[PDB]
Protein backbone atom coordinates (compact mmCIF):
# COMPACT_ATOMS: atom_id res chain seq x y z
CA UNK A 1 0.00 0.00 0.00
CA UNK A 2 1.43 3.35 -1.16
CA UNK A 3 2.74 5.76 1.48
CA UNK A 4 1.09 9.06 2.36
CA UNK A 5 4.02 11.13 3.61
CA UNK A 6 2.71 14.55 4.59
CA UNK A 7 4.59 17.59 5.83
CA UNK A 8 4.55 17.94 9.62
CA UNK A 9 7.39 20.37 10.44
CA UNK A 10 9.75 22.78 8.75
CA UNK A 11 13.06 23.36 10.51
CA UNK A 12 14.66 26.77 9.94
CA UNK A 13 17.95 28.11 11.22
CA UNK A 14 20.78 27.41 8.81
CA UNK A 15 21.92 30.53 6.94
CA UNK A 16 23.29 28.82 3.83
CA UNK A 17 22.54 25.61 1.92
CA UNK A 18 21.88 22.58 4.08
CA UNK A 19 24.17 19.74 2.94
CA UNK A 20 23.18 16.61 4.89
CA UNK A 21 20.63 15.36 7.44
CA UNK A 22 20.90 12.11 9.45
CA UNK A 23 18.74 10.49 12.15
CA UNK A 24 20.49 9.24 15.28
CA UNK A 25 20.42 5.44 15.58
CA UNK A 26 18.40 5.73 18.81
CA UNK A 27 15.66 7.59 16.94
CA UNK A 28 15.74 10.66 19.18
CA UNK A 29 17.58 13.23 17.09
CA UNK A 30 18.22 14.64 13.65
CA UNK A 31 21.62 16.18 12.85
CA UNK A 32 22.09 18.60 9.99
CA UNK A 33 25.23 20.01 8.40
CA UNK A 34 25.44 23.16 6.29
CA UNK A 35 27.53 25.39 4.05
CA UNK A 36 27.13 27.89 6.94
CA UNK A 37 29.86 25.93 8.81
CA UNK A 38 27.40 24.73 11.44
CA UNK A 39 25.92 21.48 12.65
CA UNK A 40 22.44 21.65 14.19
CA UNK A 41 20.61 19.06 16.32
CA UNK A 42 16.79 18.79 16.22
CA UNK A 43 14.19 16.53 17.81
CA UNK A 44 13.50 13.64 15.43
CA UNK A 45 9.74 13.52 16.00
CA UNK A 46 8.78 17.22 16.17
CA UNK A 47 11.77 19.03 14.70
CA UNK A 48 12.38 20.95 17.92
CA UNK A 49 15.66 22.86 17.78
CA UNK A 50 18.10 21.43 20.33
CA UNK A 51 21.57 22.92 19.77
CA UNK A 52 24.17 24.32 17.40
CA UNK A 53 27.63 22.77 17.14
CA UNK A 54 30.41 24.95 15.73
CA UNK A 55 34.14 24.89 15.05
CA UNK A 56 34.84 24.19 11.38
CA UNK A 57 36.57 27.03 9.53
CA UNK A 58 34.66 26.47 6.28
CA UNK A 59 31.39 24.90 5.19
CA UNK A 60 30.46 21.28 5.88
CA UNK A 61 29.36 18.72 3.27
CA UNK A 62 28.39 15.74 5.47
CA UNK A 63 27.79 14.66 9.06
CA UNK A 64 27.29 11.16 10.53
CA UNK A 65 26.38 9.52 13.85
CA UNK A 66 28.16 6.89 15.87
CA UNK A 67 26.19 3.73 16.67
CA UNK A 68 25.52 4.73 20.28
CA UNK A 69 24.15 8.16 19.21
CA UNK A 70 26.81 9.92 21.33
CA UNK A 71 29.25 11.13 18.66
CA UNK A 72 29.16 12.91 15.33
CA UNK A 73 31.76 13.23 12.59
CA UNK A 74 31.64 16.04 10.02
CA UNK A 75 33.44 16.55 6.68
CA UNK A 76 34.46 20.10 5.75
CA UNK A 77 35.83 22.30 2.97
CA UNK A 78 38.53 23.18 5.52
CA UNK A 79 40.15 19.82 4.57
CA UNK A 80 39.45 18.27 7.97
CA UNK A 81 36.94 16.08 9.68
CA UNK A 82 35.91 16.77 13.26
CA UNK A 83 34.65 14.30 15.85
CA UNK A 84 32.08 15.85 18.19
CA UNK A 85 30.66 14.92 21.54
CA UNK A 86 26.94 15.50 20.96
CA UNK A 87 26.00 16.12 24.60
CA UNK A 88 28.65 18.80 25.23
CA UNK A 89 28.86 20.03 21.63
CA UNK A 90 32.65 20.08 21.86
CA UNK A 91 35.19 18.98 19.27
CA UNK A 92 37.07 15.90 20.49
CA UNK A 93 39.41 15.45 17.53
CA UNK A 94 40.32 17.13 14.28
CA UNK A 95 41.25 14.61 11.60
CA UNK A 96 43.95 16.07 9.37
CA UNK A 97 45.40 14.60 6.19
CA UNK A 98 43.16 15.26 3.20
CA UNK A 99 44.57 17.78 0.72
CA UNK A 100 41.25 19.10 -0.57
CA UNK A 101 37.61 19.42 0.54
CA UNK A 102 36.38 16.49 2.64
CA UNK A 103 33.05 15.47 1.14
CA UNK A 104 31.62 12.40 2.86
CA UNK A 105 32.02 10.44 6.07
CA UNK A 106 30.71 7.56 8.17
CA UNK A 107 31.44 5.57 11.32
CA UNK A 108 31.70 1.79 11.17
CA UNK A 109 29.09 -0.15 13.17
CA UNK A 110 31.56 -0.69 16.04
CA UNK A 111 32.26 3.06 15.75
CA UNK A 112 35.97 2.67 16.50
CA UNK A 113 36.68 3.75 12.89
CA UNK A 114 35.63 6.59 10.59
CA UNK A 115 35.85 6.47 6.81
CA UNK A 116 36.10 9.67 4.73
CA UNK A 117 36.15 10.58 1.05
CA UNK A 118 37.58 13.76 -0.41
CA UNK A 119 37.95 15.87 -3.53
CA UNK A 120 41.61 14.83 -3.25
CA UNK A 121 40.41 11.53 -4.84
CA UNK A 122 41.31 9.45 -1.77
CA UNK A 123 39.51 7.49 0.91
CA UNK A 124 40.91 7.61 4.44
CA UNK A 125 40.29 5.31 7.41
CA UNK A 126 40.72 6.95 10.82
CA UNK A 127 41.00 5.75 14.39
CA UNK A 128 38.29 7.44 16.47
CA UNK A 129 40.15 7.18 19.80
CA UNK A 130 43.48 8.62 18.63
CA UNK A 131 42.12 10.90 15.92
CA UNK A 132 44.88 9.72 13.59
CA UNK A 133 44.73 8.32 10.07
CA UNK A 134 45.29 4.57 9.79
CA UNK A 135 45.10 4.12 6.02
CA UNK A 136 45.01 6.29 2.92
CA UNK A 137 43.50 4.45 -0.06
CA UNK A 138 44.36 5.55 -3.61
CA UNK A 139 40.72 4.91 -4.27
CA UNK A 140 39.68 6.87 -7.33
CA UNK A 141 40.68 9.04 -10.29
CA UNK A 142 38.21 11.87 -9.51
CA UNK A 143 36.45 13.26 -6.41
CA UNK A 144 35.07 10.66 -3.96
CA UNK A 145 31.34 11.30 -3.59
CA UNK A 146 30.36 8.75 -0.91
CA UNK A 147 31.76 6.22 1.56
CA UNK A 148 29.83 3.65 3.65
CA UNK A 149 30.69 0.63 5.82
CA UNK A 150 28.77 -2.61 5.54
CA UNK A 151 26.92 -4.12 8.49
CA UNK A 152 29.91 -5.66 10.27
CA UNK A 153 32.39 -2.96 9.22
CA UNK A 154 34.51 -5.42 7.23
CA UNK A 155 33.81 -3.66 3.91
CA UNK A 156 33.76 -0.08 2.69
CA UNK A 157 32.01 0.98 -0.49
CA UNK A 158 33.20 4.18 -2.19
CA UNK A 159 31.94 6.04 -5.26
CA UNK A 160 33.46 8.66 -7.52
CA UNK A 161 32.94 10.92 -10.51
CA UNK A 162 35.37 8.52 -12.24
CA UNK A 163 32.31 6.31 -12.81
CA UNK A 164 33.37 3.56 -10.39
CA UNK A 165 32.04 2.02 -7.24
CA UNK A 166 34.73 0.16 -5.34
CA UNK A 167 34.49 -2.22 -2.42
CA UNK A 168 37.44 -2.25 -0.01
CA UNK A 169 38.56 -4.65 2.67
CA UNK A 170 38.60 -2.47 5.80
CA UNK A 171 41.33 -4.44 7.57
CA UNK A 172 43.91 -4.28 4.75
CA UNK A 173 42.68 -1.32 2.73
CA UNK A 174 42.89 -3.48 -0.41
CA UNK A 175 40.29 -3.46 -3.18
CA UNK A 176 37.94 -6.47 -3.32
CA UNK A 177 35.75 -5.52 -6.27
CA UNK A 178 35.07 -2.71 -8.76
CA UNK A 179 31.53 -2.23 -10.08
CA UNK A 180 31.74 -1.28 -13.78
CA UNK A 181 29.49 0.53 -16.29
CA UNK A 182 30.20 0.66 -20.05
CA UNK A 183 28.53 4.06 -20.22
CA UNK A 184 30.45 5.17 -17.13
CA UNK A 185 28.45 8.12 -15.80
CA UNK A 186 29.80 9.90 -12.68
CA UNK A 187 28.70 8.10 -9.50
CA UNK A 188 27.39 10.60 -6.94
CA UNK A 189 26.29 8.37 -4.04
CA UNK A 190 26.59 4.77 -2.78
CA UNK A 191 25.33 2.88 0.28
CA UNK A 192 25.01 -0.75 1.40
CA UNK A 193 21.47 -2.06 1.77
CA UNK A 194 19.76 -2.92 5.12
CA UNK A 195 20.32 -6.68 4.56
CA UNK A 196 23.97 -6.14 3.66
CA UNK A 197 23.91 -7.74 0.21
CA UNK A 198 23.02 -4.88 -2.16
CA UNK A 199 24.54 -1.49 -2.94
CA UNK A 200 22.43 1.48 -3.98
CA UNK A 201 24.29 3.80 -6.38
CA UNK A 202 23.30 7.16 -7.82
CA UNK A 203 24.71 8.40 -11.11
CA UNK A 204 24.54 11.90 -12.58
CA UNK A 205 22.37 10.78 -15.48
CA UNK A 206 19.14 10.91 -13.44
CA UNK A 207 19.42 7.27 -12.34
CA UNK A 208 19.59 5.18 -9.19
CA UNK A 209 20.61 1.52 -9.39
CA UNK A 210 20.45 -1.39 -6.97
CA UNK A 211 23.51 -3.59 -7.43
CA UNK A 212 23.90 -7.19 -6.36
CA UNK A 213 27.25 -6.97 -4.57
CA UNK A 214 27.96 -10.72 -4.75
CA UNK A 215 27.33 -11.00 -8.50
CA UNK A 216 28.65 -7.54 -9.36
CA UNK A 217 25.64 -6.54 -11.45
CA UNK A 218 22.59 -4.27 -11.52
CA UNK A 219 19.23 -5.65 -10.32
CA UNK A 220 16.94 -2.59 -10.23
CA UNK A 221 16.93 0.84 -11.90
CA UNK A 222 14.93 3.86 -10.62
CA UNK A 223 14.22 6.91 -12.77
CA UNK A 224 11.88 9.86 -13.09
CA UNK A 225 13.76 12.31 -10.92
CA UNK A 226 16.39 14.92 -11.84
CA UNK A 227 20.01 14.37 -10.86
CA UNK A 228 22.85 15.61 -13.06
CA UNK A 229 24.61 18.23 -10.92
CA UNK A 230 24.74 17.37 -7.18
CA UNK A 231 25.64 14.48 -4.91
CA UNK A 232 22.18 13.75 -3.53
CA UNK A 233 21.78 11.21 -0.72
CA UNK A 234 19.48 8.23 -1.23
CA UNK A 235 17.99 5.78 1.25
CA UNK A 236 16.27 2.50 1.81
CA UNK A 237 13.02 3.02 3.71
CA UNK A 238 12.25 -0.16 5.63
CA UNK A 239 10.02 0.77 8.58
CA UNK A 240 6.88 0.32 6.46
CA UNK A 241 6.60 -0.30 2.74
CA UNK A 242 9.93 -1.10 1.13
CA UNK A 243 10.94 2.08 -0.68
CA UNK A 244 13.86 3.89 -2.21
CA UNK A 245 13.96 7.57 -1.19
CA UNK A 246 15.93 10.37 -2.81
CA UNK A 247 16.11 14.11 -3.25
CA UNK A 248 15.96 15.63 -6.71
CA UNK A 249 17.02 18.74 -8.58
CA UNK A 250 13.37 19.60 -9.37
CA UNK A 251 12.90 20.35 -5.62
CA UNK A 252 10.93 17.17 -4.88
CA UNK A 253 11.50 14.12 -2.70
CA UNK A 254 11.01 10.96 -4.73
CA UNK A 255 9.81 7.67 -3.26
CA UNK A 256 9.89 4.47 -5.34
CA UNK A 257 8.69 0.95 -4.68
CA UNK A 258 11.97 -0.99 -4.35
CA UNK A 259 10.64 -4.09 -6.10
CA UNK A 260 8.51 -2.61 -8.88
CA UNK A 261 10.57 0.58 -9.35
CA UNK A 262 7.35 2.58 -9.70
CA UNK A 263 7.27 6.06 -8.21
CA UNK A 264 4.80 5.85 -5.30
CA UNK A 265 5.05 9.42 -4.01
CA UNK A 266 6.62 12.79 -4.77
CA UNK A 267 6.83 15.22 -1.82
CA UNK A 268 6.34 18.85 -2.78
CA UNK A 269 7.23 21.89 -0.70
CA UNK A 270 10.94 22.67 -0.94
CA UNK A 271 11.97 25.65 -3.10
CA UNK A 272 15.47 24.50 -4.04
CA UNK A 273 17.30 21.25 -4.84
CA UNK A 274 16.64 18.56 -2.25
CA UNK A 275 20.24 17.59 -1.55
CA UNK A 276 19.60 15.16 1.30
CA UNK A 277 16.99 12.82 2.67
CA UNK A 278 17.04 10.40 5.61
CA UNK A 279 14.68 7.77 7.00
CA UNK A 280 13.92 7.33 10.68
CA UNK A 281 15.22 4.02 12.08
CA UNK A 282 11.87 2.81 13.52
CA UNK A 283 9.01 5.19 12.57
CA UNK A 284 7.68 6.10 9.11
CA UNK A 285 9.31 9.54 9.07
CA UNK A 286 11.45 11.16 6.36
CA UNK A 287 13.70 14.20 6.75
CA UNK A 288 14.65 16.28 3.71
CA UNK A 289 16.90 19.31 3.26
CA UNK A 290 17.46 21.86 0.53
CA UNK A 291 20.02 24.20 -1.04
CA UNK A 292 20.52 27.99 -0.66
CA UNK A 293 17.20 29.36 -1.88
CA UNK A 294 15.37 27.25 0.70
CA UNK A 295 17.82 26.28 3.45
CA UNK A 296 15.19 24.45 5.51
CA UNK A 297 14.79 20.87 6.63
CA UNK A 298 11.36 19.25 6.42
CA UNK A 299 9.93 16.35 8.44
CA UNK A 300 7.28 14.22 6.75
CA UNK A 301 5.22 11.42 8.32
CA UNK A 302 3.31 8.56 6.71
CA UNK A 303 0.73 6.13 8.12
CA UNK A 304 2.54 3.24 6.40
Amino acid sequence: VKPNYALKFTLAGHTKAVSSVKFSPNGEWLASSSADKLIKIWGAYDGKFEKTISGHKLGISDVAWSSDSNLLVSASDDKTLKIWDVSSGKCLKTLKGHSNYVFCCNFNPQSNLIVSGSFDESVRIWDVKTGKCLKTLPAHSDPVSAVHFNRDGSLIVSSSYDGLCRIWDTASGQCLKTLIDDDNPPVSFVKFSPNGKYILAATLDNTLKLWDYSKGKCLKTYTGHKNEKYCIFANFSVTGGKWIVSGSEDNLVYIWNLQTKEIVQKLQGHTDVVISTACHPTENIIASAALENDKTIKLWKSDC
Binding site: K16, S20, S34, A35, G59, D77, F103, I275
Partner: peptide, 14 residues
Protein backbone atom coordinates in the same frame (compact mmCIF):
# COMPACT_ATOMS: atom_id res chain seq x y z
CA UNK B 1 36.76 28.25 -2.86
CA UNK B 2 33.25 26.97 -3.36
CA UNK B 3 31.08 30.09 -3.78
CA UNK B 4 28.05 28.39 -2.13
CA UNK B 5 30.13 27.62 0.96
CA UNK B 6 30.70 23.87 0.70
CA UNK B 7 31.57 21.31 -1.97
CA UNK B 8 28.27 19.47 -1.83
CA UNK B 9 26.16 22.58 -2.52
CA UNK B 10 28.34 23.51 -5.51
CA UNK B 11 27.06 22.27 -8.87
CA UNK B 12 29.43 19.88 -10.67
CA UNK B 13 31.43 21.31 -13.55
CA UNK B 14 31.43 19.57 -16.95
Amino acid sequence: VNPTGCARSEPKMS
